[PDB]
Amino acid sequence: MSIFIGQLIGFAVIAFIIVKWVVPPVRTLMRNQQEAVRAALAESAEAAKKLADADAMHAKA
Amino acid sequence: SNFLIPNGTFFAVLIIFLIVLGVISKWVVPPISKVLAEREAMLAKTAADNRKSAEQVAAAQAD
Amino acid sequence: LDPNAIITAGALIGGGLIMGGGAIGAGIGDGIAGNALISGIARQPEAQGRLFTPFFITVGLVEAAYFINLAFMALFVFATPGLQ
Amino acid sequence: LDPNAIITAGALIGGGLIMGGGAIGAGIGDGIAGNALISGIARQPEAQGRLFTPFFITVGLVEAAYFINLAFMALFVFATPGLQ
Amino acid sequence: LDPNAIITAGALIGGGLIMGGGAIGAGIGDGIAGNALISGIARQPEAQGRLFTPFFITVGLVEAAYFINLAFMALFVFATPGLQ
Amino acid sequence: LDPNAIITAGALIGGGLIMGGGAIGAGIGDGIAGNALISGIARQPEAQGRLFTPFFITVGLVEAAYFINLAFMALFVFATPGLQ
Amino acid sequence: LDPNAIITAGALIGGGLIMGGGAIGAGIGDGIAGNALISGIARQPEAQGRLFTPFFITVGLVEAAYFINLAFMALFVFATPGLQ
Amino acid sequence: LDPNAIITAGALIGGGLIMGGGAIGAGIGDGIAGNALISGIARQPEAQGRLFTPFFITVGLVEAAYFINLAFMALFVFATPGLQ
Amino acid sequence: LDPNAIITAGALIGGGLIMGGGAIGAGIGDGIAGNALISGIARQPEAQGRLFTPFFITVGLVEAAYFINLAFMALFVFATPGLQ
Amino acid sequence: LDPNAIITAGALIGGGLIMGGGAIGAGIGDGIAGNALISGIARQPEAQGRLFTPFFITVGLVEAAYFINLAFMALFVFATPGLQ
Amino acid sequence: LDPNAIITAGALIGGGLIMGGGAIGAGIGDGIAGNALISGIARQPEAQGRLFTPFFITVGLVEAAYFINLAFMALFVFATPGLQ
Amino acid sequence: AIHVGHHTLVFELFGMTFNGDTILATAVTAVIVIALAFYLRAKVTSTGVPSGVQLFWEALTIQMRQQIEGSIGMKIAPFVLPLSVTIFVFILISNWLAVLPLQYGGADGAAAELYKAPASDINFVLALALFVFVCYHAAGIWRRGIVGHPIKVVKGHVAFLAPINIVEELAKPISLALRLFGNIFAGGILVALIAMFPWYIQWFPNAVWKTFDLFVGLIQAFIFSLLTILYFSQSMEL
Predict the structure, then answer these.
(1) Contact present, G62 and E31 (Cβ < 8 Å)
(2) Where is the chain membrane-spanning (chains C, D, E, F, G, H, I, J, K) (predicted)?
């Protein structure tokens, strides 16, 4: 109880500090890696479409 | 008293640990390696596609 | 007098010496590794990322010594071998 | 010849040893880390911020060891293990 | 043999150890920080004003480490835990 | 007074010093080798491949000494020779 | 056995520990600061005077710890705490 | 009281100090030599086998003393000088 | 067990430790200053005549501390404070 | 409590301190000398033939300080002074 | 028991500690000076003649201190102050 | 009243004593890791953006792969990576779960916890170290035959120091086990100590120590990993 309440307060402080000054960089890294993967996939799709267009041009030649 | 003396858990952990090992070796490492290979192949295909598009444009110009 | 008292006092002094040596080692090692890392970062900071690969483990190894002694120190202060 | 006398004496010896060793460790670690910080600031002063993360990590761990000793000392003097 | 006398003896031993360690750590750390400052100022006279800051950090941390052990030794002699 | 108790207390103190000395030796060795490795990697990321090989030898030797202390320490605290 | 005998034995050994640690720390700090100043002067002797200003302070700061110890060392040799 | 017990305790303490000091010295020396070897390897890749021959020599000597020291430690523990 | 006997034994141990720590500090600081002077003279021979003034400024002070401890050693071994 | 017993115990402790300090000094000196030799030979192997001249002196002057010290340890085990 | 026993044992332990400290100082100083001289001779062979001028001083200023320590040990052993 | 040790849930079975507290802790950690494993298996994807669990798992795999490839090429040792990943993730999760609020009034002036970090028992670390030891010695035997491996290890890189070589091979496992114990067991002590202070003053030191213990457990997982990979590499070369 007493020690339980004290350690509960300690954990509450820990969690608030983590979410107030530690989480943001982690979320930033997650979002940045996700967007890098998405951009790589979009690059793949557009490169495939570019090759298709080049093949169409060749056929037109 | 004298916790440094080992005990039956000396095996139990190992047993449990063994199971964990297998799981990671069955549905974590293999699939993740496959995903990494897929991404690397996708990047290689993208670069090759860009190069081949440039080359094809140049050729079509040449023909 | 009670032999338990003498043996316990000796074990406590031993554990104190254990903490002494371990603290000396941990302080020196952490300081030295930090100095190496800081100098490296200042010199050619382009290594910023990779320079965190060894430092950590080095500190780890350093701390290992300290805390392994602490483990035995616990044995000297909670379950004294040879107590009678 | 109260055994508790010898128990308290030995525990206090241990506390003194622990605190001396911790003091030495903290001094050496923070001094060497500060030396590295001075060198870094001298070489690339504009990089002062970049040198804070290593430095604030070194102490960020070094002093921890001292604190451990501190806490452990508090055990011997007040709640001496093995005290009757 | 009054137990409190032996407790006082142990307190004297512990204080000797604590002060020895604190002096060792403070001297070594502050001297190393001074060495770094001397090297930095020698490399470039301009950086002294902005050099003092990290040196201030070094000296403040080393002090804290030494003064805390001073206070613990004072507590040991001011009122030794376990005295009865 | 119980003679074997005095012998055992002496053995415990001896083992405490054993492990403390081993601890500080390991700390110094690991710190020095880690400084070498950190400086090398900072200078030469390419050379990393040929850094670990010799490096471990150092640590090996370092540990090769440290644990030896521990070994004898165990004896002193578990197979005290001459302990009647 | 007169308790004051043990009190003064402990006090003398404790003060001896104080002076030993203080000597270690002051010697190391003086040596290191002098090394810094020597290297600096060797590099660019023309600025010797300026180099004194930091050194003349920092070295003294290390010695400050020395004096502090001495003061309390006197408390352990002139007015011993707990003497009775 | 039985004097042989006091002799045994003293011998154990002396051997502990002996081999602890030996291990400390060996660890520090091997660490320093490994630092030199690592720096050489980093700076001179073509010196792989060129550097090992001298380094071992130093280590050997550093090792020798320690083992030699270790040997005499055994002497105290098992064949205690002056035992009656 | 004459109380003066214990008092004098404590005085002897304390003084020995005092001047031993003095030896520690003197040796280490002297070695460091000698390294500084050797490197300086090797680098700039013509600065030799001008590099002595700071060197003697440092080492001298080192010796002072040593001698100071030496002096106090006498106080412990001949004018043993508190003798009765 | 035969006087010879206490004399022998003190002799063992003193000899242990003696030879442990000797081992520390020998290890540090030999290791540092080897580090210097290794760095020098790595920088310019062609100079090895001359490099070993000062080195043979350095360690030569280190082990000597150890060896003589060791001799005195033998004095405290073979025929202790003041054996009474 | 006989006061002679305790006084002689204390003086002998103090002398052993004194010798340990002297050995530490001699080892550290000798190693540092040797490293400096080794690097100097590696840098400039012609410096061989010049570098002997400071080196002999440093060792002379180091070893001399050690020898002083030596003397005091005898004063502790054969002419134990306060012996009675 | 410090109550160091005194493992709860102690039970005998077939003439062997077991500390059930470590059993419960390890079982919970294994359950958590298994849950993460299946959760990744349910969304292991390349077409779309990865989920957080996939990101974490691929970060772990990236670290292990880079370390192994840097030390010894994967082509020789394809089985290092799963073992290293398991070791790192398992230890990290086990120690991280210790940060949870499981201190309660002991009715005795002491503190007890339902979930203690499994490393607080020497048995756990000894089992892990022995497992790695047997694994890489078997790997070395499979690499350079039954006769070669003892010859290589004993002779060491230098034959002038045959004795010390033996020691390191005995040390290698020890270095892995005992240190780990320390860096976790210390935590198990400090919290108990912090129990003496009243709540209204105890909340702060407890919190700071819990944060530093999170960090310490992370670094210990990392060092244990790198050490096991490099030990494998050391004993898997000709």
Answers:
(1) yes
(2) 4-30, 51-79
CB atoms within 10 A of CB H74: 14
Technique used:
cryo-EM
Q: Count how many residues are written for chain E.
A: 84
Contact residues on chain K for J56, CB-CB shorter than 8 A? none
d(CA H55, CA F57): 12
Q: D9 to chain E: which residues are within 8 Å by CB?
A: 6-7, 9-10
Neighbors of chain H by Cβ distance (3+ pairs < 8 Å)? F, J, L
Could you tell me which residues are beta bridge partners of residue L13?
L16
Any domain includes L2: no
Task: Give the start-to-end residue ranges of the domains of chain A.
Answer: 22-61
Half-sphere exposure of L164 (CA within 13 A, CB side): 23
The answer to whether the CB of L230 falls within 8 A of the CB of F51 is no
Q: Does D65 touch chain C (CB under 8 A)?
A: yes
Please check whether residue K38 is in contact with residue J50, taking contact to mean a CB–CB distance below 8 angstroms: no
Q: Which of residues 5-44 of I touch G (CB under 8 A)?
A: 5-7, 9-11, 13-18, 20-22, 24-33, 35-37, 39-41, 43-44
> CA of D42 to nearest chain L CA: how many angstroms apart?
31
**Closest Cβ opposite residue F35 in set C36, C65, C80:** C36
- Per-residue H/E/C for chain G: CCHHHHHHHHHHHHHHHHHHHHHHHHHHHHHHHHHHHHHHHHHCHHHHHHHHHHHHHHHHHHHHHHHHHHHHHHHCCCCCCCCC
Residue A31, number of CB atoms within 10 A of its CB: 10
Pick the CATH number of G3-78 from 3.10.20.310, 1.20.20.10, 3.40.50.720, 3.30.420.10: 1.20.20.10
Select from L127, L176, L92 the least CA-distant residue to L18. Answer: L127
> How many domains does chain L fold into?
1
Q: Which of L13, L26, L86 sits opposite B24 (nearest CB)?
A: L86
Chain B residues with beta carbon closer than 8 angstroms to that of A42: none
Do G69 and G19 meet the contact criterion of CB atoms below 8 Å apart? yes
Chain C contact probe: residue of L88, L174, L213, L223 with most C CBs at under 10 A: L223
Q: Do chains L and F touch (3 or more CB pairs under 8 A)?
A: yes
Q: Which chains lie within 8 Å of chain G at 3 or more CB pairs, if any?
A: E, I
- Set of chain I residues whose Cβ sits within 8 Å of the Cβ of G59: 61
Whether the Cβ atoms of residue L216 and residue L187 lie closer than 8 Å to each other: yes
Q: Which helix (H) or strand (E) holds K39?
A: helix K3-43
Q: How far apart are CA L85 and CA B62, in angstroms?
A: 54
Collapsing DSSP to helix, strand or coil, L104 comes out as: strand
Angstrom CA distances, I68 to G66, K65, L22, stand at: 11, 13, 58
- The C-alpha atoms of residue I25 and residue I59 are separated, in whole angstroms, by 11
**Closest chain D C-alpha to E38 CA, distance in angstroms:** 9
Chain-chain contact of J5 with H9 (C-beta, under 8 angstroms):
no
CA–CA distances in Å: residue A57 to residues A47, B45, B49, C51, I72: 15, 20, 15, 50, 99
What's the rounded Cα separation, in Å, for the pair C80 and C3? 13
Long-range contacts of K40-47 (CB under 8 A, 24+ apart): K40/I38, K40/I39, K40/I41, K40/I42, K41/J40, K41/J47, K41/J50, K41/J51, K41/J53, K41/J54, K42/J39, K42/J40, K42/J41, K42/J43, K42/J44, K42/J47, K42/J51, K43/I42, K44/I42, K45/J47, K45/J50, K47/I42, K47/I45
Q: SS in 3 state form for L146-207?
A: HHHHHHHHHHCCCHHHHHHHHHHHHHHHHHHHHHHHHHHHHHHHHHHHHCCCCHHHHHHHHH
Q: Which residues pair with L17 in a beta bridge?
A: L12
Other beta carbons less than 10 A from residue L155's beta carbon: 12
